[PDB]
Amino acid sequence: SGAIYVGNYRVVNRHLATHNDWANLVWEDSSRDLLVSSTTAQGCDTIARCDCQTGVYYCSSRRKHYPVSFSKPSLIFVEASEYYPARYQSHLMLAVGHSEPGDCGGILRCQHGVVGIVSTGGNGLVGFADVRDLLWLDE
């Protein structure tokens, strides 16, 4: 579990979005596993605007932060689940690191700010849904 709070927006994994998230929907993309809802309170997270391939992510299954090298956002195959059929997930970045079900929503940050959130993993890998291209989150 976990979300990014920037301005009047809340960014969450689309498969974990609540009734309130869907009732206050701004944008969602099943292919990216992202959903953005509106909030009344102001969010103070800062979004990174860069091409960093190194950063630190929060791993709830270890209650720890880990430094990682991660790939550029790309289309990657993702197996079926109670949330999606087998498909390519776009804007996804992989890293070698620990992650297990329950870790989705963990933030990945670089020195510039928030890069993305945990969305996939297993087998000694962790996948992050990138948010750096969503320039509208700032305005």
Ligand X SMILES: C[C@@H](C(=O)N1CCC[C@H](C(N)=O)C1)c1noc2ccccc12
**Binder of residue 101, out of ligand X, Zn ion, none (CB less than 5 to 8 A by kind):** ligand X
Rounded CA separation 106/59 (Å) = 6
Rounded CA separation 4/95 (Å) = 20
Say whether 98 counts as a known binding-site residue. no
Binding flag, residue 15, ligand X (CB under 6 A): yes
Residue 59 is among the residues annotated as catalytic for this protein: no
Say whether 59 counts as a known binding-site residue. no
Residue 10, both tokens: 């809340």
Residue 104 is among the residues annotated as catalytic for this protein: yes
Residue 15 is among the residues annotated as catalytic for this protein: yes
In this structure, the number of other CB atoms found within 10 A of the CB of residue 123 comes to 7
Query: Which residue type occupies 42?
Result: Q
Catalytic residue among 21, 33, 45, 130: 33
Binding flag, residue 130, ligand X (CB under 6 A): no
| DSSP label at residue 83 | S
Q: Considering the complex, what minimum distance in angstroms separates the CB of residue 113 from Zn ion?
A: 7
Binding flag, residue 34, Zn ion (CB under 5 A): no
* Strand order across the beta sheet in which 25-29 lies: 4-13, 34-44, 25-29
Residue positions counted in the chain:
139
Q: Which is nearer to Zn ion, 25 or 50 (CB)?
A: 50
Q: Pick from 35, 55, 59, 89 the residue near ligand X by CB under 6 A.
A: 89
Taken in order 86, 125, 117, 1, the sign of the CA dihedral is: positive
Rounded CA separation 55/71 (Å) = 11
Q: Which is nearer to ligand X, 37 or 89 (CB)?
A: 89
As annotated, the binding site for Zn(2+) includes 50, 52, 110, 112
Binding site for ligand X (CB under 6 A): 15, 33, 78, 81, 83-84, 89, 99-101, 103-104, 118-122
